[PDB]
Coordinates of C-alpha atoms and ligand atoms in Angstrom, one line a residue:
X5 CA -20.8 69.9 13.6
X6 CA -21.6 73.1 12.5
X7 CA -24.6 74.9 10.9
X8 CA -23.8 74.8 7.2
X9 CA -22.4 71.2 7.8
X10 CA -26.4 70.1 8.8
X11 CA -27.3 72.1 5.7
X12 CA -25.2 70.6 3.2
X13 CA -25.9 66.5 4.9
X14 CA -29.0 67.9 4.5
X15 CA -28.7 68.8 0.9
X16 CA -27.1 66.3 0.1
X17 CA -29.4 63.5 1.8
X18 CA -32.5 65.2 -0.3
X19 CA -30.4 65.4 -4.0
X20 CA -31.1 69.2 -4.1
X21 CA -28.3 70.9 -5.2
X22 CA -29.4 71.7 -8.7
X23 CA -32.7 73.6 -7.0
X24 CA -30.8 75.3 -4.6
X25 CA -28.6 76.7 -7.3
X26 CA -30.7 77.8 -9.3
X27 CA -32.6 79.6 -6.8
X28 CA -29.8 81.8 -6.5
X29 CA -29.6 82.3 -10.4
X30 CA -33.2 83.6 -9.9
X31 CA -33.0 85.7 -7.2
X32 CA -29.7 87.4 -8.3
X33 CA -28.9 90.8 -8.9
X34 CA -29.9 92.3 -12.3
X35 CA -28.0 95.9 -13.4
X36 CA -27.2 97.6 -16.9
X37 CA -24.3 96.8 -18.7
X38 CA -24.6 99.4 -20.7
X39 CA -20.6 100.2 -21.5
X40 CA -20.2 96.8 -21.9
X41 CA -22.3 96.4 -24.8
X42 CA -21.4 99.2 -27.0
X43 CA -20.7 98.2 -30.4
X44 CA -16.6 99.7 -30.0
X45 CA -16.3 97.4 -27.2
X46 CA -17.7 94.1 -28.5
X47 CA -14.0 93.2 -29.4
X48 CA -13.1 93.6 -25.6
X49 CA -15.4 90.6 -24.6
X50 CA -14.5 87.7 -24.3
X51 CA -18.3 86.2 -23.9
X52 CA -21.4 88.0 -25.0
X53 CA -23.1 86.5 -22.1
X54 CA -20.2 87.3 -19.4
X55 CA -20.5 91.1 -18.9
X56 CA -19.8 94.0 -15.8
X57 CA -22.2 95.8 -14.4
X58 CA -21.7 99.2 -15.1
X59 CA -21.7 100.1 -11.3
X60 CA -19.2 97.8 -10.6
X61 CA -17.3 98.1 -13.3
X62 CA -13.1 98.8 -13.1
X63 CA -12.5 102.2 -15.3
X64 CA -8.8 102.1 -17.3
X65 CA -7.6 105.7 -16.5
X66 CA -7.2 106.6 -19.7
X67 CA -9.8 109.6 -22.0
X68 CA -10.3 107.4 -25.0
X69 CA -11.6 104.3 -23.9
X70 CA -11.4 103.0 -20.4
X71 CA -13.7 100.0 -20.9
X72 CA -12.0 96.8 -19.3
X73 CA -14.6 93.6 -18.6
X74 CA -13.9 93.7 -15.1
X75 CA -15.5 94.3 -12.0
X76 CA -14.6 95.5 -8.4
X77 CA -16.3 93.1 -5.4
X78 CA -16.5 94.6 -2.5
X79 CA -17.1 93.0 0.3
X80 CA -18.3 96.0 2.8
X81 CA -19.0 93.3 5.9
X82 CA -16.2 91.3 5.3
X83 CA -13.8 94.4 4.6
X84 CA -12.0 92.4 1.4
X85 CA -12.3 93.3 -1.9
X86 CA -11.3 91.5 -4.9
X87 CA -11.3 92.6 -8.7
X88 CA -12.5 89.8 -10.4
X89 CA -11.8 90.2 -14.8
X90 CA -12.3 87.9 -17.9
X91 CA -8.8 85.6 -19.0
X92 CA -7.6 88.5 -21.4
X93 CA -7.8 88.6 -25.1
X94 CA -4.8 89.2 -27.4
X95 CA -5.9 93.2 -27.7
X96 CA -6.4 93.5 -24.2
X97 CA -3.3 92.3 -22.2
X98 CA -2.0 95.5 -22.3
X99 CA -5.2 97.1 -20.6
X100 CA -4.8 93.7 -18.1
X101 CA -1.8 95.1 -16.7
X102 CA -2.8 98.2 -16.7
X103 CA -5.6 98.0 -14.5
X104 CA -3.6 96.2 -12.3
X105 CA -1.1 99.2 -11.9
X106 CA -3.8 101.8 -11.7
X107 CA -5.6 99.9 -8.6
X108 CA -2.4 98.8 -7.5
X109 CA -2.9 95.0 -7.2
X110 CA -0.3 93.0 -5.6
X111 CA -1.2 89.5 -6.3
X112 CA -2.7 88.2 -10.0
X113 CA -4.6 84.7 -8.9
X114 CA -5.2 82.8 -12.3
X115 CA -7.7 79.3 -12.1
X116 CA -7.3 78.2 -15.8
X117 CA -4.6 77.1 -18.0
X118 CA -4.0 78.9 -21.2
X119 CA -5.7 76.1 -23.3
X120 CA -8.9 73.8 -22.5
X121 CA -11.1 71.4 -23.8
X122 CA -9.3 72.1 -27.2
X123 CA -9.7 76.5 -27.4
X124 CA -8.1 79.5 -26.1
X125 CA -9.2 80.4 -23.1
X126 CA -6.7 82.9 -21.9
X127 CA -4.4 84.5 -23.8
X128 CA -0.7 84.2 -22.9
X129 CA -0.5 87.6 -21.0
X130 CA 2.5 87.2 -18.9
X131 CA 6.1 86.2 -19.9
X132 CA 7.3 82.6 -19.7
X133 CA 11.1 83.1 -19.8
X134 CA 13.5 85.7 -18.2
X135 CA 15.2 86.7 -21.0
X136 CA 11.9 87.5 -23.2
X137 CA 10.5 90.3 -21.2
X138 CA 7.1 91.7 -22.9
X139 CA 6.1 95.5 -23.8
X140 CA 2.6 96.5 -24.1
X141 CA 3.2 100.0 -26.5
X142 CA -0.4 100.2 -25.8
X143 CA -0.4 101.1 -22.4
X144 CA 3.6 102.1 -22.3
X145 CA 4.1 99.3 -19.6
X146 CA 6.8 96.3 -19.4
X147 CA 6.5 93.0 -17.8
X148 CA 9.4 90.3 -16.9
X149 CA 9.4 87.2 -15.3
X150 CA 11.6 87.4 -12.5
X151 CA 11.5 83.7 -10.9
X152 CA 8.6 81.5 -11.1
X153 CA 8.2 78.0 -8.0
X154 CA 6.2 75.5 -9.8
X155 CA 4.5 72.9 -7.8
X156 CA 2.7 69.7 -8.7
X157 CA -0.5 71.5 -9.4
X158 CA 0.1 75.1 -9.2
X159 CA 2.6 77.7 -10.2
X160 CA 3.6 81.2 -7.8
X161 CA 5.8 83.3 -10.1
X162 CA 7.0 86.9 -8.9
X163 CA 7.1 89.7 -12.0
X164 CA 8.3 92.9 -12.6
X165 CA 6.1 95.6 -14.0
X166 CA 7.1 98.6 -15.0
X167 CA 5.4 101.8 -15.8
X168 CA 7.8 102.8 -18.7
X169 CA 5.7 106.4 -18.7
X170 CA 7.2 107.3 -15.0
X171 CA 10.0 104.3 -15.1
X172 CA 8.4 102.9 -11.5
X173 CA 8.6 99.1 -10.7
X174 CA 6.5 96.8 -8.5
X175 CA 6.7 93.3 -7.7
X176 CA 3.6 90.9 -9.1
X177 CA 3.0 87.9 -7.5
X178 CA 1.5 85.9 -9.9
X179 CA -1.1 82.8 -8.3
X180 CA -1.3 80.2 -11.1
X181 CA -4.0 77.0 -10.2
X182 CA -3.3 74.9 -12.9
X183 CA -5.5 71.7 -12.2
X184 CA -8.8 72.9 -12.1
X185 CA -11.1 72.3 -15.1
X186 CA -13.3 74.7 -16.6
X187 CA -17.1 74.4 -15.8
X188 CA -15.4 71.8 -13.2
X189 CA -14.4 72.1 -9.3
X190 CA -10.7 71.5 -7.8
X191 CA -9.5 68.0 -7.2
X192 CA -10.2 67.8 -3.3
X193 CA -10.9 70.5 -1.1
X194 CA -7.2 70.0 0.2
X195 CA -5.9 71.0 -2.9
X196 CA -8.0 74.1 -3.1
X197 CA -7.6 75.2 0.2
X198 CA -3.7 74.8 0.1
X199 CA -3.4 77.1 -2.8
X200 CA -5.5 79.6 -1.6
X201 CA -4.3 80.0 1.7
X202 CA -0.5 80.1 -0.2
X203 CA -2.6 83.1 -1.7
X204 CA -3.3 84.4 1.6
X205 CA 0.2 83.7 3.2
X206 CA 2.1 86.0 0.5
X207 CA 0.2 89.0 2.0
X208 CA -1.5 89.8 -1.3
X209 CA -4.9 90.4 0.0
X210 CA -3.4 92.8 2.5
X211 CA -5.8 95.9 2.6
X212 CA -2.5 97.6 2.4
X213 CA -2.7 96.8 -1.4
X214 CA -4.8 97.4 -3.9
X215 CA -7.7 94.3 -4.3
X216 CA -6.5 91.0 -5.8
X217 CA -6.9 90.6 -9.2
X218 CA -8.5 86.7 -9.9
X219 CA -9.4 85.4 -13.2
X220 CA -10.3 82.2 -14.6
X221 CA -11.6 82.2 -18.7
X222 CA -14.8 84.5 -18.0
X223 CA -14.1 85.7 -14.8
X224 CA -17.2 84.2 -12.8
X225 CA -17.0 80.6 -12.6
X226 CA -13.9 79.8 -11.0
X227 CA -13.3 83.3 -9.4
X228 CA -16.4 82.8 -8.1
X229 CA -15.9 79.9 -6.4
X230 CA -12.4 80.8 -5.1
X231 CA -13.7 84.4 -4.0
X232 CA -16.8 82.9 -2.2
X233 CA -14.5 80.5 -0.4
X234 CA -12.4 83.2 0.9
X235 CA -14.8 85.7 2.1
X236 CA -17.1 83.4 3.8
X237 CA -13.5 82.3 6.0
X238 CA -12.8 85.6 6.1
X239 CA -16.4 86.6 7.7
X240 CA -16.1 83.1 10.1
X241 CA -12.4 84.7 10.8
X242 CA -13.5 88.2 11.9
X243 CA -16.5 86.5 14.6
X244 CA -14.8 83.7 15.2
X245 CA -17.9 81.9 14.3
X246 CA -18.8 79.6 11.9
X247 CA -22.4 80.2 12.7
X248 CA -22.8 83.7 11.4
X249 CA -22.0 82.7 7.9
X250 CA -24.8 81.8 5.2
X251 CA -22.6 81.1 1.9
X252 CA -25.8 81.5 0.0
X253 CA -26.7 85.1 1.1
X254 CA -22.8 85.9 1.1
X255 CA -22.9 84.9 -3.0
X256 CA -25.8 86.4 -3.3
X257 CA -24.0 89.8 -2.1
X258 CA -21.3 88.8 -4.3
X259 CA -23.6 88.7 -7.0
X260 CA -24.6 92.3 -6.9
X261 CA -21.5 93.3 -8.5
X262 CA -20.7 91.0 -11.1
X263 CA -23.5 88.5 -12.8
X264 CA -22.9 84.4 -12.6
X265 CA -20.7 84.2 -10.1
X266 CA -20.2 80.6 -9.4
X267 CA -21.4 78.3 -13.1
X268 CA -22.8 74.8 -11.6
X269 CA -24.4 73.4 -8.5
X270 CA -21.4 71.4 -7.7
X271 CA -19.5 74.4 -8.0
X272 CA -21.1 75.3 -4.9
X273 CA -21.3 72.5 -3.0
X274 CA -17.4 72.3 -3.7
X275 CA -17.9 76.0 -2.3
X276 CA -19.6 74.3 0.8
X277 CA -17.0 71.6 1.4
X278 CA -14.2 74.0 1.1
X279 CA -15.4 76.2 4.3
X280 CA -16.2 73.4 6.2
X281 CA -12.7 72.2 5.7
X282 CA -11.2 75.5 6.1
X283 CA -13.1 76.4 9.1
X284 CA -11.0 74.0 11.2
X285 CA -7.5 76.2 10.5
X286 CA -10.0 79.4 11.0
X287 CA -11.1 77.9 14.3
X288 CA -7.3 77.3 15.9
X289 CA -6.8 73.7 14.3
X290 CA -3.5 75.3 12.1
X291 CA -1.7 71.4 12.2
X292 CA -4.9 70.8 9.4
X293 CA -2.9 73.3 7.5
X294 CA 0.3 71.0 7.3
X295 CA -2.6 67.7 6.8
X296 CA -3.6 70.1 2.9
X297 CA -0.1 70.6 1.8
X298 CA 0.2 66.4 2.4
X299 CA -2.9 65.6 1.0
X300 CA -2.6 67.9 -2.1
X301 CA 1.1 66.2 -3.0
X302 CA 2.8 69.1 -4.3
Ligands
OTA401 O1 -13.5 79.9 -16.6 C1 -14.5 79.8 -15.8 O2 -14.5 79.2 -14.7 C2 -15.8 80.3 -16.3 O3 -16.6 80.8 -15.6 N1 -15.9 80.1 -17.7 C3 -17.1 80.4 -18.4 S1 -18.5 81.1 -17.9 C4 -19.3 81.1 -19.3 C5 -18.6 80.5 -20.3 C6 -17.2 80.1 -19.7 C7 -16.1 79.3 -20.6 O4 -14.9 79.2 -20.1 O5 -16.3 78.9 -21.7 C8 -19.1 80.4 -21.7 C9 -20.2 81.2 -22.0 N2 -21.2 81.3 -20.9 C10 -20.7 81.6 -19.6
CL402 CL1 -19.9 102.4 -29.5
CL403 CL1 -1.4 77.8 -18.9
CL404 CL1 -7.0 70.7 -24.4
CL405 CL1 -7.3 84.5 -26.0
CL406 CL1 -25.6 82.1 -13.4

C-alpha cells in the first residue's frame, strides 16, 4: 500500500476526520477581498461568505467594472492551473462567458445541477436546445449548443461561442457532473474518477489552452474537491510517485488562492479515496480505467 493509504486506515481506524479538517480551516490562507466587498459589487455574489482573494482574483477586461467572483489556481509545482468561479447569477452569465473568452478556456467543468435542495443554485447560463441560441448584449457575445452526449450521470456538450465584437468562434466543451449533491461527495470514487478523467481525455486541461474553468454553486466545495483530486494525480504523474504527494499540504497550497476550498471532512476523505483509486491508472494499471466506466454504469 502506499503512504496516504496508511494515513487514511489510519484516520479512519482513530474517527478523526472532522479534526483533521478542520485543522486545515485553521491554518489556511487569509488575504483581502477588498473588490469583492464593495458595495457596487454585492449584486455579483452569489454568497457573502464565498469571496476571491483580491490576488487571485480573474479581472473582466473591460474599464467600468471588471469584478467577476472568480479566482485563478495556480498550481506552480504541478504546472496546472484551473479558474475555479461561483455557479453564475442571472446578471452575471454574460461576464461568465466572458471570462472564459478573455483567458481562453477550453473546457467549462460544472458539479451541480441547476436546482438543489429546493433553490437556485446556478443559473441557467448555457443554451439547452440548438435552435435557441443565447446573446449576452452585455458583453456582445453569443452562445449555441452545438451537440450535447448525455450519460447516465453526467452530460459533455460541445458549444459555440462567439465574440460578436470581432465575429471569432471557439468550440466549448462543456463537463456537466450531474449526480453529485451539494455539501455531499460523488456516488463512488468510480464514478468520479470516470468523469474526470473524460475531462482529462478531451484535452481541455492542455497548457495549450487557457486554465479550465470548474464551478459548482460557490465555487469551493465541489471544485475543490474535483481540483484537489486532479492535481495531487497530476503531481504523483509527473514523479511517478505516489509518495511525494501530501493531499493536505497540496489543499493547503490550493487554499492560498481562493478561501474554503473543499466544505466537509468527508469531502476530503472522498478526496483521499479518489487518489488512491486513481493512482493505480497513474501508476501503469490503465485496464482500472475500463473497471470505472463499468462500475459507474453510464
Ligand atoms: O456547490 C458547492 O459545492 C459549494 O461549495 N456550495 C457552497 S459553499 C457555501 C455555501 C454553498 C451552497 O451551495 O449553498 C453556502 C454559504 N456558505 C458557503
Ligand atoms: Cl462600490
Ligand atoms: Cl442542471
Ligand atoms: Cl430540488
Ligand atoms: Cl441563479
Ligand atoms: Cl472552510
Amino acid at each position: 500500500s502506499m503512504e496516504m493509504e496508511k494515513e487514511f486506515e489510519q484516520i479512519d481506524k482513530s474517527g478523526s476526520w472532522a479534526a483533521i479538517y478542520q485543522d486545515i480551516r485553521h491554518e489556511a490562507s487569509d488575504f483581502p477581498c477588498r473588490v469583492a466587498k464593495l458595495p457596487k459589487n454585492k449584486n455579483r455574489n452569489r454568497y457573502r461568505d464565498v469571496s476571491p482573494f483580491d490576488h487571485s482574483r480573474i479581472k473582466l477586461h473591460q474599464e467600468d467594472n471588471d469584478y467577476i467572483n472568480a479566482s485563478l489556481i495556480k498550481m506552480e509545482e504541478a504546472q496546472r492551473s484551473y479558474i475555479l468561479t461561483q455557479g453564475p447569477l442571472p446578471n452575471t452569465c454574460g461576464h461568465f462567458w466572458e471570462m472564459v473568452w478573455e483567458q481562453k478556456s477550453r473546457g467549462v467543468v460544472m458539479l451541480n445541477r441547476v436546482m438543489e435542495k429546493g433553490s437556485l443554485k446556478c443559473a441557467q447560463y448555457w443554451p439547452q436546445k440548438e435552435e435557441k441560441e443565447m446573446i449576452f448584449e452585455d458583453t456582445n457575445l453569443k452562445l449555441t449548443l452545438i451537440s450535447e452526449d448525455i450519460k447516465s450521470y453526467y452530460t459533455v456538450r460541445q458549444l459555440e461561442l462567439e465574440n460578436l465584437t470581432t465575429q471569432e468562434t471557439r468550440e466549448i466543451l462543456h463537463f456537466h457532473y450531474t449526480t453529485w449533491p451539494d455539501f455531499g461527495v460523488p456516488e463512488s470514487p468510480a464514478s468520479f474518477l470516470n468523469f474526470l478523467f473524460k475531462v482529462r481525455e478531451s484535452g481541455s486541461l492542455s497548457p495549450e489552452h487557457g486554465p479550465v474553468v470548474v464551478h459548482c454553486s460557490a465555487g469551493i466545495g465541489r471544485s475543490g474537491t474535483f481540483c484537489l483530486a486532479d492535481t495531487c494525480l497530476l503531481l504523483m504523474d509527473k514523479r511517478k510517485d505516489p509518495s511525494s504527494v501530501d493531499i493536505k499540504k497540496v489543499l493547503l497550497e490550493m487554499r492560498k488562492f481562493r478561501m474554503g476550498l473543499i466544505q466537509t471532512a468527508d469531502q476530503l476523505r472522498f478526496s483521499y479515496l479518489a487518489v488512491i483509486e486513481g493512482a493505480k491508472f497513474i501508476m501503469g494499471d490503465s485496464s482500472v480505467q475500463d473497471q470505472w466506466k463499468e462500475l459507474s454504469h453510464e
